[PDB]
Amino acid sequence: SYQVLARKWRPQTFADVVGQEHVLTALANGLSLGRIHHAYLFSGTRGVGKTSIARLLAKGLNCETGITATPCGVCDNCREIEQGRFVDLIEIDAASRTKVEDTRDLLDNVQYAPARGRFKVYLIDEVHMLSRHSFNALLKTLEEPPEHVKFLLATTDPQKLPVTILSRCLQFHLKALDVEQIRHQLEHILNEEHIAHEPRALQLLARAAEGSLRDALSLTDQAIASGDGQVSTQAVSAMLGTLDDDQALSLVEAMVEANGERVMALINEAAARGIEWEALLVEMLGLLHRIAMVQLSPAALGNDMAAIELRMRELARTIPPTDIQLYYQTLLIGRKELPYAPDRRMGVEMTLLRALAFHPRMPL
Amino acid sequence: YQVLARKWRPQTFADVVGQEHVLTALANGLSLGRIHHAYLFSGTRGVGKTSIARLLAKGLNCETGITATPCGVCDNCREIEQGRFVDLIEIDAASRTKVEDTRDLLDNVQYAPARGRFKVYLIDEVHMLSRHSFNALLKTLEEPPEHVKFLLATTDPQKLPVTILSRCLQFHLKALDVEQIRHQLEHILNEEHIAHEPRALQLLARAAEGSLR
Amino acid sequence: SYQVLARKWRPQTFADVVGQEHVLTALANGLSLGRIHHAYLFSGTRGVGKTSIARLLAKGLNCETGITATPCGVCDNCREIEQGRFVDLIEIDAASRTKVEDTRDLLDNVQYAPARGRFKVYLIDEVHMLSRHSFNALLKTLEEPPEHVKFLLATTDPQKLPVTILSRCLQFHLKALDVEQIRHQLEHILNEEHIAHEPRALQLLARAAEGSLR
Amino acid sequence: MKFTVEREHLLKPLQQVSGPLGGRPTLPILGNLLLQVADGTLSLTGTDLEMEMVARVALVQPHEPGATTVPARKFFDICRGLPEGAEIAVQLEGERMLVRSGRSRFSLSTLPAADFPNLDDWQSEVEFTLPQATMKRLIEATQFSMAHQDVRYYLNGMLFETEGEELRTVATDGHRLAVCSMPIGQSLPSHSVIVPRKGVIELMRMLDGGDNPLRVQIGSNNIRAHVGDFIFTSKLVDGRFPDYRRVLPKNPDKHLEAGCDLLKQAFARAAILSNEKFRGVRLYVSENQLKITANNPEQEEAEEILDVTYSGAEMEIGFNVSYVLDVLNALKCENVRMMLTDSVSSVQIEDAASQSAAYVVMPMRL
Amino acid sequence: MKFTVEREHLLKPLQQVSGPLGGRPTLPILGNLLLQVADGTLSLTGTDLEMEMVARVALVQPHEPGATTVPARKFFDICRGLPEGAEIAVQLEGERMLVRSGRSRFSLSTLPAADFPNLDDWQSEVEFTLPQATMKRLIEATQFSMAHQDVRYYLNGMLFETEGEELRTVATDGHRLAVCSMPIGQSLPSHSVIVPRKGVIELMRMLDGGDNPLRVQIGSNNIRAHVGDFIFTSKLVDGRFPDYRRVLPKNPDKHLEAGCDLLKQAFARAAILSNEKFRGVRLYVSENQLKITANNPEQEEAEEILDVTYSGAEMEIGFNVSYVLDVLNALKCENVRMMLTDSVSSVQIEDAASQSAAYVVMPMRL
Amino acid sequence: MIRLYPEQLRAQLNEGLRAAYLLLGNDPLLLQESQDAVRQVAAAQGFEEHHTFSIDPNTDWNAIFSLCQAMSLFASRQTLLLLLPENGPNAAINEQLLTLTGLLHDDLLLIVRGNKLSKAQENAAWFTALANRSVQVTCQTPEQAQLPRWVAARAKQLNLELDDAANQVLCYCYEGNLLALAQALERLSLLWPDGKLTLPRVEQAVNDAAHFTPFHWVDALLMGKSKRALHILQQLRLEGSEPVILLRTLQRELLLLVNLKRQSAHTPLRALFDKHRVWQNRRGMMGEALNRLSQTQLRQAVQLLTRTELTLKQDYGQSVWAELEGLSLLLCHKPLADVFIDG
DNA sequence: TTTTTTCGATCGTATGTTGTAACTATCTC
DNA sequence: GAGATAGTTACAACATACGATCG
Numbered sequence A: 001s002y003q004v005l006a007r008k009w010r011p012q013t014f015a016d017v018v019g020q021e022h023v024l025t026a027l028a029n030g031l032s033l034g035r036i037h038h039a040y041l042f043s044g045t046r047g048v049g050k051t052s053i054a055r056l057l058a059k060g061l062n063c064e065t066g067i068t069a070t071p072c073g074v075c076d077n078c079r080e081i082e083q084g085r086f087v088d089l090i091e092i093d094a095a096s097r098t099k100v101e102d103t104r105d106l107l108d109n110v111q112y113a114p115a116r117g118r119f120k121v122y123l124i125d126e127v128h129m130l131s132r133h134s135f136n137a138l139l140k141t142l143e144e145p146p147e148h149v150k151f152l153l154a155t156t157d158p159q160k161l162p163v164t165i166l167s168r169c170l171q172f173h174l175k176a177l178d179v180e181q182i183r184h185q186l187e188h189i190l191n192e193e194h195i196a197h198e199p200r201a202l203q204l205l206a207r208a209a210e211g212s213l214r215d216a217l218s219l220t221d222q223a224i225a226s227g228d229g230q231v232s233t234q235a236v237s238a239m240l241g242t243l244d245d246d247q248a249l250s251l252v253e254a255m256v257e258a259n260g261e262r263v264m265a266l267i268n269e270a271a272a273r274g275i276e277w278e279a280l281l282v283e284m285l286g287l288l289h290r291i292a293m294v295q296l297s298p299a300a301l302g303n304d305m306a307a308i309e310l311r312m313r314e315l316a317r318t319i320p321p322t323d324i325q326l327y328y329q330t331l332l333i334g335r336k337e338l339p340y341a342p343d344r345r346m347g348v349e350m351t352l353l354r355a356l357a358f359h360p361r362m363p364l
Numbered sequence B: 001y002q003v004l005a006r007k008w009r010p011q012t013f014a015d016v017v018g019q020e021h022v023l024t025a026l027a028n029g030l031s032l033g034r035i036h037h038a039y040l041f042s043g044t045r046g047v048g049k050t051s052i053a054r055l056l057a058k059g060l061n062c063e064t065g066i067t068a069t070p071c072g073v074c075d076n077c078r079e080i081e082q083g084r085f086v087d088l089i090e091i092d093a094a095s096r097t098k099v100e101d102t103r104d105l106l107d108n109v110q111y112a113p114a115r116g117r118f119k120v121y122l123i124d125e126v127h128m129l130s131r132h133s134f135n136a137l138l139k140t141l142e143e144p145p146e147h148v149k150f151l152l153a154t155t156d157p158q159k160l161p162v163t164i165l166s167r168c169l170q171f172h173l174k175a176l177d178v179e180q181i182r183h184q185l186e187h188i189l190n191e192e193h194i195a196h197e198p199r200a201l202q203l204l205a206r207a208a209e210g211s212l213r
Numbered sequence C: 001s002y003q004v005l006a007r008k009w010r011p012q013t014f015a016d017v018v019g020q021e022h023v024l025t026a027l028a029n030g031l032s033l034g035r036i037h038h039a040y041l042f043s044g045t046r047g048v049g050k051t052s053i054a055r056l057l058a059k060g061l062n063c064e065t066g067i068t069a070t071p072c073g074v075c076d077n078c079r080e081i082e083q084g085r086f087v088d089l090i091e092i093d094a095a096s097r098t099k100v101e102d103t104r105d106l107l108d109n110v111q112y113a114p115a116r117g118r119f120k121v122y123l124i125d126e127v128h129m130l131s132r133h134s135f136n137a138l139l140k141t142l143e144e145p146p147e148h149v150k151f152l153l154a155t156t157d158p159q160k161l162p163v164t165i166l167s168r169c170l171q172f173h174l175k176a177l178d179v180e181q182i183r184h185q186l187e188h189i190l191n192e193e194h195i196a197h198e199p200r201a202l203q204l205l206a207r208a209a210e211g212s213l214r
Numbered sequence D, E: 001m002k003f004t005v006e007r008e009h010l011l012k013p014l015q016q017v018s019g020p021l022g023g024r025p026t027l028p029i030l031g032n033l034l035l036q037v038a039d040g041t042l043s044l045t046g047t048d049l050e051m052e053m054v055a056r057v058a059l060v061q062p063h064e065p066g067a068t069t070v071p072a073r074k075f076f077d078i079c080r081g082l083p084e085g086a087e088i089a090v091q092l093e094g095e096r097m098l099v100r101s102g103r104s105r106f107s108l109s110t111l112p113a114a115d116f117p118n119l120d121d122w123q124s125e126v127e128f129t130l131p132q133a134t135m136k137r138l139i140e141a142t143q144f145s146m147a148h149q150d151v152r153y154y155l156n157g158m159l160f161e162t163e164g165e166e167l168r169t170v171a172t173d174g175h176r177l178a179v180c181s182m183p184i185g186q187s188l189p190s191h192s193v194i195v196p197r198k199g200v201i202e203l204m205r206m207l208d209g210g211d212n213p214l215r216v217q218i219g220s221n222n223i224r225a226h227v228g229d230f231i232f233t234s235k236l237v238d239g240r241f242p243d244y245r246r247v248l249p250k251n252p253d254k255h256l257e258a259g260c261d262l263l264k265q266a267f268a269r270a271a272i273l274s275n276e277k278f279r280g281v282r283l284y285v286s287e288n289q290l291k292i293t294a295n296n297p298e299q300e301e302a303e304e305i306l307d308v309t310y311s312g313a314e315m316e317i318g319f320n321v322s323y324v325l326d327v328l329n330a331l332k333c334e335n336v337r338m339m340l341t342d343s344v345s346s347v348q349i350e351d352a353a354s355q356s357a358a359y360v361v362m363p364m365r366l
Numbered sequence F: 001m002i003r004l005y006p007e008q009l010r011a012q013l014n015e016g017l018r019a020a021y022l023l024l025g026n027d028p029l030l031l032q033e034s035q036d037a038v039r040q041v042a043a044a045q046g047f048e049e050h051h052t053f054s055i056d057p058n059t060d061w062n063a064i065f066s067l068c069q070a071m072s073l074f075a076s077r078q079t080l081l082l083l084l085p086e087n088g089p090n091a092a093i094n095e096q097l098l099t100l101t102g103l104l105h106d107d108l109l110l111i112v113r114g115n116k117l118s119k120a121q122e123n124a125a126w127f128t129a130l131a132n133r134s135v136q137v138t139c140q141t142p143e144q145a146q147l148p149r150w151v152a153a154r155a156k157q158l159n160l161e162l163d164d165a166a167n168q169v170l171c172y173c174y175e176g177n178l179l180a181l182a183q184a185l186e187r188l189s190l191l192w193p194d195g196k197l198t199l200p201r202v203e204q205a206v207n208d209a210a211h212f213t214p215f216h217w218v219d220a221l222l223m224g225k226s227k228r229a230l231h232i233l234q235q236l237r238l239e240g241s242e243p244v245i246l247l248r249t250l251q252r253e254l255l256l257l258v259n260l261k262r263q264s265a266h267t268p269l270r271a272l273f274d275k276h277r278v279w280q281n282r283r284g285m286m287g288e289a290l291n292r293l294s295q296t297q298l299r300q301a302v303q304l305l306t307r308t309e310l311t312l313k314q315d316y317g318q319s320v321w322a323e324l325e326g327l328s329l330l331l332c333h334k335p336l337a338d339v340f341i342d343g
Numbered sequence G: 001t002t003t004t005t006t007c008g009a010t011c012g013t014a015t016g017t018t019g020t021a022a023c024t025a026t027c028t029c
Numbered sequence H: 001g002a003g004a005t006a007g008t009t010a011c012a013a014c015a016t017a018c019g020a021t022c023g
């Protein structure tokens, strides 16, 4: 069995959380000083620790010793909260329960005093899926909240909530986990699990994670399965190559340096999986246009292309503008002529060959 | 009489053509005992996503035990072959795209399997589910019961939310080459006792692109 | 009351069609050898006989005498199919039934056995007008239909269908009719109708037809 | 217009007229019923542009001829709220109507009577009269089998066929068929018509078990029913209805006899753990034995076994339990005969004592 | 777990236990009934994390101790559908429950009994036994005045107060108030609690009018009720209930006495044409005369006049007819006494001969 | 009707309490603060009952009318709150509000929240009925020019010290979103009890959550700030704005500039501005635009805009944002070699 | 002191209003 | 005390408003 790494390694303490200092420090100071707000909201990308931090805060609020930022983890309340059997902690999957009738019964329990806890904690996750009537009921409940109830909200789309709901809760935004922290966490987990590994494999997995720890753990599990109980550089590289889906940028880089063999290999790899050739041409045209814009002004490239920022910057810095314009025009002509080519693959190959070796002759 | 596509569906891991990496990973996972709870299969049409999913279900639910080489002769294997196995719940997401169906399905996930050791949900064409349906599966998929496994197959993976993708192990099947298709056609025709010529088989293989169907 | 030549002279036997020899030979061989598929698609230009051949195949499948490539044309099933009021032959106009709800309702009733004929035939016309959801809903049942149902599809724009649908059915392409064939058919029809004509008029009409008999 | 009338004599006609009127008329005039007084009679009329109901009440008090339109709901509520034995005096003044009675006064609004729609006259091709009980039995034997909102517009009504010395009612929805026949005692020309479901419901509500014979007139595309002081007029679907003779199985070779109550209870118990969407059950027939099995998506299984009169070969079939339960409820007999041929053919159900009514149900390939 | 019982001995307790359950529960386990067999006793438990119902049945046949959880509606339907007088044998095999009755077999899915929530024990503070009739009278008198959905939670329940040898029930919603009180014959310490709506509903349902006394225990935050072999436990709402004594008028100078049935009929007739949106009526009171008037935006007016026993000065006052009709329906007596001071002050309604129950209604701005 | 700003609302409430309060604006923070102050003052005066409703086509006005008409046994002094639609009231809403204003009582305190009303909305029967007994508080988000003063004052009232660099960073990161900025100040105060907020300290706990409108993008294009224009365009794309709105907003100003450039050859600019009804404040920026773009330009821009419109309309293309970025760079003085203009 | 948008066809979710069927309590013989 | 009638509760169908995707 061995369980799953994502489930097994849930952070059970504030010290186990990776990064997110600007949130944990504020929460600890608030708990120590007694400055506790009525409603908390957590936002961020996938797999950054919103639910983990919410559960840790809920555990800290209702600990036997007292309101502290360092829960003991041994009293009955801590164990029940960890196992998910605590009576005074109500966890609501708003995605599964969206209708007003379902939410009304849950929200009507605020009229009963807590059974065995200082506070009655409601942890509503995926709260952006609620309907308008559910939002109205939640707002009415939050207008006059009893002094012994707290609301914790977690979502990835805070813009979907009404402004009235947002204005009555304190919002914390979580950040990406960065490559170094992800690599360190993976190394620690593998060392605890007694699994052989190499630095290069860990670096590749961390880079492919793209700021999400759950993605990193899933990739690590897949690599362990592929490597037959071991994590090796060759196995991880092969696995990533299998899932690689950025043939457009690689094709652009190969074409710009006039390397026909690499272009043919990339075309074969793209054809190995099911891809739309016109989509590939559109992606290449978009990449060339973005490179031209970046050459015009460095601010053109934004945070949406953070994954391939370095390669785009290098291409913009190295390639002269005239070559970029020539390639863009050649690809435009190729896209225009694609429908009448003998085949889509043949059309793409002919256009890439023309870009590699040939130059059109313009009138006059 | 019976259509070749339906008649010659693989029933053992040895009958699968190509897809070496996926089969090796699945076999290693089954042998070591490290079994996930959410698998996603991607690829072009007619490459064997459903076949591999059914083979994995057979391996999980075989009477002999959790093995990478299902016997293919016990009651569970035969029932899975005939599509009459109670614990293999096959959902056609293309038809049931509404959130009400998803809620009904989720309301009965904690009940134990009738006869097998695992309850396997095989959702086909999962890319056609509605946004509410996708968001309703997040928590159950993240932390399912011990005796529940989810298998997902689609040809358009990019339409799924990133949150769904982060919760499952992804396997991308690759299109088959001419040589493998020609060899499979030769084997099938030899088993069927039908005369053939090499050039005809080469033409058929080239005209089929990379899909066996 | 009065019926135009196009409606009156719809072929009612495999020997009454013009051209399309390869399709007819393939269908006859398949019926004779007993190898019957569960999904047929017909493609071609306009007015080449896709619907006619589909109806002929449906009539041959459900004939009382048996599964034959030469329907008798005299039993009750053949007459009812010719009149277009046969219970087990369900004809769908996809150009006006594009809604996915209609497709789901149709698929929910495939479990019921046929009333009179040995097969329940679905003839979907203008299938290229269905929505994406309709195609995706069809896919699963089209892959593995029950043993007592058949699907016949006719279209003029096969490019619009998804590759998944095309992969699940046997495709027959109908060539555009030649000038000589159209001229001969017109001459035969006029002779049967007792109408005076001249060779040059027939030649001009056939040339202006541009490969379409309708 | 001015007239005084007893409350009791006016209660029932008001309810009968207001029956056909719907909750949402979409037109103010439609929501109001037409009230006329002429000579020595008071006529209440209610229509919805598809159906028409007319009731007449005798007048013994002095009155003046007139016509108007009044809301059905408010007038009916006012009349019903008054104490028993009260006399209602209705008078028209300008655009208002005084309904003074005892110490209570009301001022109902009115609209012009000329705006009330009317139905064009038609020629009655066939006319006959039958007892109320026969019509009630005919309608009840086949009402439940009518399609609710099927795409076929002609399957939403009941088929009435007058032939020889008998009248026949047929109902179907594409998967089940119900046929009933009853003698009328008078020879009539062969004729077939289709009546919409709303007309059938109104006709059923009209019947009260009285001894007054009910008179039926049928034209090209209209039907009229007369009973007592009540007249009802409706249109016809004028559609193509399948022949029931084709649907009936031909020379079935397997016969089964069972008790209605025990079989109904067994089917009801089995239906509890059946699929909610499809409601499918499996029947196994063997020598003097019937077994019913049901399964649901949760894999909960229900099994029932009973003893019947059967001597044929063993057989297995599938069915929709809802249709069987409806047929058994409709029969209300002591014994039931089921006729079958094979697992892929339809099954006929009839009463052992009488063959007046028959039902046909097709199987499912579970 | 194995046991055998009779249909009659299990039909009613199962219905009582499964009545509260419905809809889609917060957790699947909450949708099931907990069955426990121990020391020749079968215990059926049903909870929804707010209130709990427990029933007990005696076993006089061989059995095996155990515990499990089963679906409520499915099991109840299966038990009810069996023939009267049948014997039901229940057994547990693996993760399934088998129910056998004659030749009928049913298989049901179950969940572990360890996951079923159980309410923690608490110590009662007040205990008293009273007849079911008194509690039923109090509830039926004071239930209709509770608020439906208000931000102030304490108004959604009912206030139960023990004072000396008297038990009092009070309800209100900010616009109307109902108070009733009855003796119990025993001295109890002064106490007050608030019962939620669902608790009151269940307490009303569990009463059957029998001679078995009802025993009530009240603690810090919970209330328990014993009736025969049925136990009902509920939680109490936290908050402060408004004091009803200040609501009652200090000195109502004007008094009136009117027939209950005649006044109710007059109010109903007036409300038949009252503005549906507002449901407002206007009362003119003069020497031995009471006139009720209503109107609607369409310039249609309804008027009625009746006689009363009044001797004060003429006055006009507006009211919401719904509250008056509810109060009149609550009071089933030959005569009703109304006490009032002016048109902008609350009106008291009581029975002519009985002082146990009183109602206070606030006039509407008109 | 009295007119006020959020700072004077507390002074007015101390002076006295009126019958109706209107809160109109686009800033959630100021609206919430005004509502809280009004409700606190009312509760001090003895208003312990509050009701809230949302104005929409599916609204139950019967409940509101019953609440207004009915009395209370003990809990008097009711407060009613209405939330107008984003678009604004329509004729049906106008007559409903007129009816509600007709049924107004001294013990009922009315509050209304919504976006700023236009002249057509202002000229309504219900609006004029409350003119003699109403006070309107205008809650508009300050522009970038006045933002740093607001940030400094808000930090001052919280007993915090902000450096100039920290203030600039806060203004840049939370422009147009005052709720987020206030919450950021609260979180910074929580993090550092000493209250010393330096640049490195603030830079750690700040994220980009700015909010913009197409008019800001057009103004940035007119000024000629490529970085600001690109940032605004990226924020608008993230929000999910409709490209057609941006296209029309740019088209109006671009056509005006083309006409002015063509007709300014033999006419002073002041006369042209007067004839074209140019607002006095904008006349500055427009001027410099005419000194930065030649007649050769403003034709390539028009061609690119027309091509983008055609692609959006008939081709249903997805590269509209790339063309918008190219046009934004074109309006600023950049080469823009014209291979991408198809000229 | 303002300046705010392309259209047609199809699919999915949530709420309010009206009508029908089954079961229970009450009324009449 | 049983059958018939009236009242209540639950489920289904129809109509309206709002949000999202692809051509």
Ligand SMILES: Nc1ncnc2c1ncn2[C@@H]1O[C@H](COP(=O)(O)OP(=O)(O)O)[C@@H](O)[C@H]1O
Pocket: A005, A006, A007, A008, A009, A010, A011, A016, A017, A018, A019, A020, A045, A046, A047, A048, A049, A050, A051, A052, A154, A213, A214
């Ligand atoms: N900051 C973190 N530190 C340690 N582990 C983390 C962190 N964030 C996420 N994880 C890992 O990712 C898994 C899923 O995180 P989850 O609670 O789903 O976050 P979110 O709610 O943002 O999706 C957890 O099991 C946890 O081990």
Ligand SMILES: Nc1ncnc2c1ncn2[C@@H]1O[C@H](COP(=O)(O)OP(=O)(O)O)[C@@H](O)[C@H]1O
Pocket: B004, B005, B006, B007, B008, B009, B010, B015, B016, B017, B018, B019, B044, B045, B046, B047, B048, B049, B050, B051, B212, B213
């Ligand atoms: N890898 C494979 N090996 C053998 N047969 C295959 C393979 N892939 C596809 N097929 C054939 O194609 C048919 C359809 O495959 P299918 O299960 O529909 O795959 P997908 O789910 O990817 O469409 C099968 O009946 C099988 O005979």
Ligand SMILES: Nc1ncnc2c1ncn2[C@@H]1O[C@H](COP(=O)(O)OP(=O)(O)O)[C@@H](O)[C@H]1O
Pocket: C005, C006, C007, C008, C009, C010, C011, C016, C017, C018, C019, C020, C045, C046, C047, C048, C049, C050, C051, C052, C154, C213, C214
């Ligand atoms: N192969 C053919 N042989 C004889 N007649 C034909 C043929 N194809 C078309 N026709 C004539 O054209 C008319 C319409 O053909 P139709 O069935 O609509 O073809 P399609 O479905 O391709 O449009 C028919 O009535 C028939 O008379």
Ligand code: ALF
Pocket: A045, A046, A047, A048, A050, A051, A154, A156, B163
């Ligand atoms: F559970 Al998440 F982002 F996937 F909070």
Ligand code: ALF
Pocket: B044, B045, B046, B047, B049, B050, B153, B155, C164
């Ligand atoms: F069944 Al497929 F792609 F056609 F998985």
Ligand code: ALF
Pocket: C045, C046, C047, C048, C050, C051, C155, C156
């Ligand atoms: F061209 Al056609 F039916 F008229 F295919």
Ligand SMILES: [Mg+2]
Pocket: A050, A051, A052, A125, A154
């Ligand atoms: Mg989470």
Ligand SMILES: [Mg+2]
Pocket: B049, B050, B051, B124
């Ligand atoms: Mg498949």
Ligand SMILES: [Mg+2]
Pocket: C050, C051, C052, C125, C154
């Ligand atoms: Mg055709």
Ligand SMILES: [Zn+2]
Pocket: A063, A064, A065, A071, A072, A073, A074, A075, A076, A077, A078
């Ligand atoms: Zn602890």
Ligand SMILES: [Zn+2]
Pocket: B062, B063, B064, B070, B071, B072, B073, B074, B075, B076, B077
């Ligand atoms: Zn096996």
Ligand SMILES: [Zn+2]
Pocket: C063, C064, C065, C071, C072, C073, C074, C075, C076, C077, C078
């Ligand atoms: Zn034939």
